[PDB]
Amino acid sequence: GHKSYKSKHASKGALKRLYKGGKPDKQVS
Amino acid sequence: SAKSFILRKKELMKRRGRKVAKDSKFTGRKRRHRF
Amino acid sequence: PRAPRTYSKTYSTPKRPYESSRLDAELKLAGEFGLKNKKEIYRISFQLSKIRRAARDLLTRDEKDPKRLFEGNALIRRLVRVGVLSEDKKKLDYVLALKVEDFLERRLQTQVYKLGLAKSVHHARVLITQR
Amino acid sequence: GRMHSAGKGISSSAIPYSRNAPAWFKLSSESVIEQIVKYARKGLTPSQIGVLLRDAHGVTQARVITGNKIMRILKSNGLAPEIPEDLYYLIKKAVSVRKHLERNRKDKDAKFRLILIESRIHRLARYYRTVAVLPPNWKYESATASALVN
Amino acid sequence: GWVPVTKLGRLVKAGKITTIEEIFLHSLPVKEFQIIDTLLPGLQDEVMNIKPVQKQTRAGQRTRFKAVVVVGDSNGHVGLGIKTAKEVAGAIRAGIIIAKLSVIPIRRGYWGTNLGQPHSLATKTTGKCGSVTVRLIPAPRGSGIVASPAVKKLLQLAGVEDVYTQSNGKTRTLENTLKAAFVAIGNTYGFLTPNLWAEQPLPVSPLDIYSDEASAQ
Amino acid sequence: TRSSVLADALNAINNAEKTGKRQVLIRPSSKVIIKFLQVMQKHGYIGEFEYIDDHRSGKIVVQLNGRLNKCGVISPRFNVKIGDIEKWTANLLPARQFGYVILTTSAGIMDHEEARRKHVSGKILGFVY
Amino acid sequence: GKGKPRGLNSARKLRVHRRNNRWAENNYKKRLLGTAFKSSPFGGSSHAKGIVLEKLGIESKQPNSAIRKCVRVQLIKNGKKVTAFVPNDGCLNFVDENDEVLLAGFGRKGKAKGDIPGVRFKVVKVSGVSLLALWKEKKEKPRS
RNA sequence: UCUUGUAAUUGGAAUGAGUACAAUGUAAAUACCUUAACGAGGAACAAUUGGAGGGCAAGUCUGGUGCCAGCAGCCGCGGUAAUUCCAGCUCCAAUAGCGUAUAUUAAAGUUGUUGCAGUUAAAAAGCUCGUAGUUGAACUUUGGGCCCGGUUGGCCG
RNA sequence: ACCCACUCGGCACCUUACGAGAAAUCAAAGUCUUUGGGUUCUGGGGGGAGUAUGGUCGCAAGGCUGAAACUUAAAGGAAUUG
C-alpha cells in the first residue's frame, strides 16, 4: 500500500468526498 | 472476555522474561463482590 | 482570637510503600525491639532525616564559618549526650553515616533490657507501661 | 553575507602590515595634498581620486602618506559635497531604475529591486542623520530626488 | 585444568603478572576469559534476565534464548555480557564468558572530603544507548543506592554504596537500562580527574620483555 | 553575525581537543579572551599560548596539552549575587572539589574559589573543568 | 540557538510567550474558564444528591447475565439528569423510585472490574443511609 | 550434651479501661494529676479498613447455582463476551485507625529560564523587504621595584 | 580552447563515523543530562473541527483569524521477519 497524506484538520478535497456524499455567542457580563 | 485478556498477556511475559505466578481456578473471577 | 498553638507531624510515610527489601528490613527492626506499629520506625527515620538534612547544608558551608561552628557543635553535643554517637566520632562527617538502629538502641525499653530487668524485649515494654 | 541577497562572497582588500610610507616612494607629503585638491577641483569623487593615484602616481594609500584620510582633506579645504559619496550613488541608481520603471509598467522584477534599493537608502540615511551629517529629517521622497542628483 | 591458547594465557600461567593495574593501564585487548578466573577469585555471579526470541523460517521455527549476566566480585570491578544461545543452559555459560571478558575498573570518589575508604562516585556521569539515558550523581554517606532495582543490583555488584540515579526516557527496556548504566560507570574511569594530572612513569608494556617465554612452543 | 567572541574561542578549543588536535588558532582576540585563558592556564588546564598581533584585532595560538574535560561560555552574563555562587556550581560542574566557574568581578576576571576568598562577586562568564 | 530569546533584557517576551502557550494546556484552561461552574453536572462539587427517576436494564447481555445495571437520576441543584452506577445485584431492591440518593464520581477503570461506557457516577448512599452498610446488613433503609 | 517452635497441657504474678471514699483541680463544677476499695482467664475487658495477571505485598484454595448440539458415559473433565453468578477458606499491607470522591502538588524535562520539541511521529509562515522588540567586532594604566602591618599551616614548645 | 597546480564563491556526488538519532539515515539532523553564540515563528493525545460565533479583506468564489460543550484509550512513526 501507499503512505497516506496526513494533516490535523481535514483537507478541502477530502471534505468534498465526505460532505457532498443562527444563535450568536454570548459573553456573560 | 476478562479471562481471555488475562491469559493473553500472561504468556507474553514468558517471552519478555519476567516472573509470573502459576494459575488456578480464580483467574477470571471477581475477587471481591463489591459494596 | 487567641494565638494558634503550633503543631507539626513527627512521621512521614514512604513514597514507595511496597518493596520486599524494605518491608523485610522494617519488620526485622520491629521484632527485635518490640515495636507496636510501623510508625515507630517512620518516626525515627523522620527525625534522622532532619538531622542529616541539617548537617548536610552545614557541610556545603566553608570551614570556620561561625554559623557552621555554632550550629555544628550544638548538633554534636545533642547527639553525644543522648548517646547516638560515641566520644571518638564528634565530627559532622560522621553524623551523615548514622543508622536507624543507633536511635532505637537508645530507647528506654531497649536500654532497660540491656540492664537486665526484662529477660525479653517484649517484657521490657510491658513492664514500663505498667508504671 | 550580503545585506539583501543570499550571496556570501569575501572579496576584499588587504592593507599591509606596514603603517609607514614604503621606501621606494619617497616623493613628498605636501605634493599629494595639492594633487588631491587639484583632482577635487575637477569635479571628481573621493573614491575615484584614490584609485587614480595608485594607478598612476604610486601613492600606496592616502591615509598613511598624508596622515589624514581623503574625506578629511577635502573637508578641511572646503570641497565636500552636500550629501556624502555613497548616499549620492544610491539615489542616482534609484532614480535611474525608477525612470526605467515608469517606462516599463509590467516589470515586476524592477519593482522588487527598487524596494531593495530604497530600503538600502533609508538604513543609510538614518545613520547619517543620527551622526548629524544631514539635516535631522532630510526626508527622501521619490519625486524630489530626481532634482537632488543633477 | 585450563589449557592456555592465546598469548596472554602464557602471561598468567607462569604467574609473572598478579595485579590488574598493569594490564589495564595500557588497556591490553583481552580475548579470553580464563585468565581472570586464575588471577582474580571471588567474582559474584548473578543472572539478570533470560528470554526466548524466535526466528521465522520458510517452513519450521528456529528459536534461541537471550541472556544478560552482570558479574563483579564486590568492589570496583564489573562486567556485562550479551549472548544469544540455542539453549538456556549454554546462554548462562556463554553469558558469563563475554561478561567477564568485558570487565572494566570503576573509579570511586567522595561526596565531601577525602577521608576513610571512598564510598561513592567521583563525577557526574551519564550513559545512553537508544533513547535510554541513565545519569549517576554522587551521594553522601548513608544515602544508600536510590536506583532502579536492576541498576541497584548492578551498583551493589560494582562496589559503590552512595549513588543518586536520575533517569530519563522510556526505560522499561531492561537490556538497554543495564548497559547504559554499565557504560556510565565505564565512562567514569574514562573521565580524567585532576588528581591523575601527574605524568605516568611510562611503563615499557611488559608483554615484549616477557615475549621470549610467551612465544609459540 | 559574530555576537560573542568568547563563545567562538571556547567552542574552537573544545572542538579541537575532542578530535585530538595539538594546537588551535583563535580569532579574534580580546581582553576577555586573554584573561579567560590565563585563569585556565594558571590552573594547568591549557598550556602556553601566543598572541599574534596584526593591526586588526589579534589572533591567538593555544598549545593544547589535554587534561581539559570541558570549557564553555555562559551567555548571557547573569548577575550573580555572592550567595548564588554555590547554586551555580551545583548545576554546571561534575563534582564539588574540582571544576571552576569564572566570574567577572570588580576586582578582575577570576574563578569562584578565589572570589569567595576575596569575598567579591559579579557577572558569570563561563565554566571550566 | 534553541529557538527562543535568551539575552538579559528579554523577560517580556519570555513572560508573555508562556502565557499564550499555557492556553494550549488542559488542566489550566479548564481551570481559568471555570467550566466546572458552567457545564459539568456537578457544579464543581465533589458529591451531589439527586432524585432517582427510573431504573434501567443496562445489562451485560441477554439472559446469561453479568448483572450490572443502574438508574436515571436528576441532580437536585442544577436540575441536570445523569446516568448512575450501582454495585452488584441485591442492591436494586434497595433503590426504589424517588429515594434521593447521594452519588459520587466513578473515575478509575481498568480492563476489568467494571467496563461500562457512558457512566461516571457511582451511587454511594440511598435514602440517607449507605450502600456499603446497607448491603452488608448493618442498617435498614426506610421506605420513602 | 545447650537453644527454638508446637499443645482445646498447666501454674501463679503485673496492670489499666472501668466503678469510686477522699484530696488536688475550678468563679462554681466536669475532666486531667494522686489514691483507700472493687475490677482478666478467653464465645473475657473479643480491632477494623482495604487488597491477591503486573503496579504489588499477597493462592499449582474450596463449595454451590445456570448454559454447552464439546469429550466420556458408575463418575466426571473442559469451556461458560455468567466481562465469573453467589458464598467461604488462606495470605498481605496499614492500624485506632482505614477506604472512596473531587481539587491541587510531586512523579513530569506534558509549560521546559534552569530544562522540551518542529526531515519522516503535533508543529519552520510560499517568498523577500521592514518599525517597535531583542542582540550587536576589537580597542584607551599593562607591567616592574620598595617597604609596612595582617590570618592560616607548620620546624619549633 | 585544452593540461597541470593553487585559490575564492557555488549546485551537487561517493566512503566513513571522531559524533548524532527510535531507526531509516545525517559534514549537518555534529559541536545537547559534560544541557546557554544571536534571534523570529509554530506545537502540547484522538474525534467534535477549520465546525459554531464575532471581526476583517474579496464583486463573487472564497481567503485570514478561530473556540467550547461532549465523547474517547488511543492516535502514530522507523525497519525486518514468516
Domain ranges of chain F: 1-68, 69-129
Q: Do residues D100 and D64 share a domain?
A: no
Asked if residue D15 belongs to a domain, the reply is no
Give the domain range for residue D51. Answer: 26-80
Stretch 40-69 of chain E: residues touching chain B, C-beta under 8 Å: 49-53
Asked if residue C34 belongs to a domain, the reply is yes
Q: Do residues D102 and D43 share a domain?
A: no
CA of D8 to C1' of I6 (A): 21
Q: What gap in Å lies between CA G11 and CA G63, rounded to an integer?
A: 68
Q: Do residues D95 and D66 share a domain?
A: no
Give the domain range for residue C64. Answer: 17-131
G61 and chain B in contact, CB less than 8 A: no
* Mutual angle of helices F31-42 and F5-18, in 10-degree steps: 40
Q: Do residues D90 and D56 share a domain?
A: no
The alpha carbon dihedral of E156, E157, E163, E165 has a sign of: negative
* Contact between C95 and C76 (Cβ < 8 Å): yes
Q: What gap in Å lies between CA C43 and CA F120, rounded to an integer?
A: 43
* Contact between C67 and C74 (Cβ < 8 Å): no
Q: Which H or E run includes F122?
A: strand F122-128
* Contact between E11 and E35 (Cβ < 8 Å): yes
Q: How many CB atoms lie within 10 A of CB D31?
A: 11
- Does E51 sit within 8 Å of B16, measured CB to CB? yes
* Contact between F44 and F68 (Cβ < 8 Å): no
3-state SS, residue E133: strand
DSSP state of E4: P
* Count: domains in chain D: 2
Nucleotide closest to residue G111 (CA–C1'): H83
* Mutual angle of helices D108-128 and D85-103, in 10-degree steps: 160
- Does G111 sit within 8 Å of B2, measured CB to CB? yes
First to last CA, chain D: 33
D15 and chain F in contact, CB less than 8 A: yes
Say which residue the cell 562486567 belongs to: E79
Asked if residue C45 belongs to a domain, the reply is yes
Q: What gap in Å lies between CA E169 and CA E133, rounded to an integer?
A: 6
Instruction: Report which residue type is found at F16.
Output: A
- Strands E145-146, E163-169: pairing is parallel
* Contact between F98 and F35 (Cβ < 8 Å): no
Q: What gap in Å lies between CA A8 and CA E17, rounded to an integer?
A: 68
* Contact between B20 and B27 (Cβ < 8 Å): no
Q: What gap in Å lies between CA F99 and CA F129, rounded to an integer?
A: 4
Asked if residue D9 belongs to a domain, the reply is no
Nucleotide closest to residue G60 (CA–C1'): H83
Q: What gap in Å lies between CA E129 and CA E181, rounded to an integer?
A: 10
Q: CB of B16 under 7 A from strand H?
A: no
Q: For residues D96-131, b (16+ Cβ closer than 10 Å) or e, as one string?
A: ebbeeeeeeeeeeeeeeebeebbebbeeebeebeee
Q: Which domains does chain E have, with CATH numbers?
A: 1-105 (3.30.160.20), 106-199 (3.30.230.10)
Q: Do residues D86 and D136 share a domain?
A: yes
Q: Do residues D66 and D111 share a domain?
A: no
Question: CATH code for F1-68?
Answer: 3.30.1370.30
Q: What angle do CA F9, F13, F19 make, to 5 degrees?
A: 145
Q: What gap in Å lies between CA E127 and CA D26, rounded to an integer?
A: 70
Domain end, chosen from D80, D106, D122, is at D80
Q: What gap in Å lies between CA E203 and CA E24, rounded to an integer?
A: 12
* Count: domains in chain G: 1
Say which residue the cell 588471577 belongs to: E39
Q: What gap in Å lies between CA G2 and CA F127, rounded to an integer?
A: 20
Torsion of CA E35, E40, E46, E48, to 10 degrees: -50
* Upstream peptide bond of F76 is cis (omega within 30 degrees of 0): yes
DSSP state of C38: T
Domain with residue D132: its CATH number is 1.10.287.10
Q: How far is CA E181 from the centre of its chain?
A: 10
Q: Which H or E run includes C82?
A: helix C66-82
C-alpha cell at C112: 532497660
* Contact between G122 and G85 (Cβ < 8 Å): yes
Q: Which H or E run includes G104?
A: strand G101-105
- Does G112 sit within 8 Å of B34, measured CB to CB? no
Q: What gap in Å lies between CA D115 and CA D122, rounded to an integer?
A: 11
CATH architecture group of domain F69-129: 2-Layer Sandwich (3.30)
Q: Do residues D91 and D65 share a domain?
A: no
Domain end, chosen from D49, D65, D80, is at D80
* Contact between D118 and D145 (Cβ < 8 Å): no
Phi, psi of B27 (to 5 degrees): -65, -45
Domain end, chosen from D80, D97, D115, is at D80
Give the domain range for residue G88. Answer: 1-144
Asked if residue C107 belongs to a domain, the reply is yes
Q: What gap in Å lies between CA D149 and CA D89, rounded to an integer?
A: 9
Q: Do residues D62 and D126 share a domain?
A: no
How many helices (H) and strands (E) chain E has is answered by 6, 10
* Count: domains in chain C: 1
Residues 36-65 of G with CB under 7 A from strand I: 39-40
Say which residue the cell 539583501 belongs to: D4
List for chain A the helix, strand, coil content (%; round to 5). Answer: 30, 0, 70
Resolution (A): 3.5
Q: How many residues does chain C have?
A: 131
Q: How far is CA A4 from CA A1, A7, C4, E111, in A?
A: 9, 10, 67, 55
Q: For residues E115-142, b (16+ Cβ closer than 10 Å) or e, as one string?
A: eeebbbbbbbbbbebeebbbbbbbbbbb
Instruction: Report which residue type is found at C79.
Output: L
Q: How many residues does chain G have?
A: 144
Asked if residue C68 belongs to a domain, the reply is yes
C-alpha cell at F13: 578549543
C-alpha cell at F43: 590552573
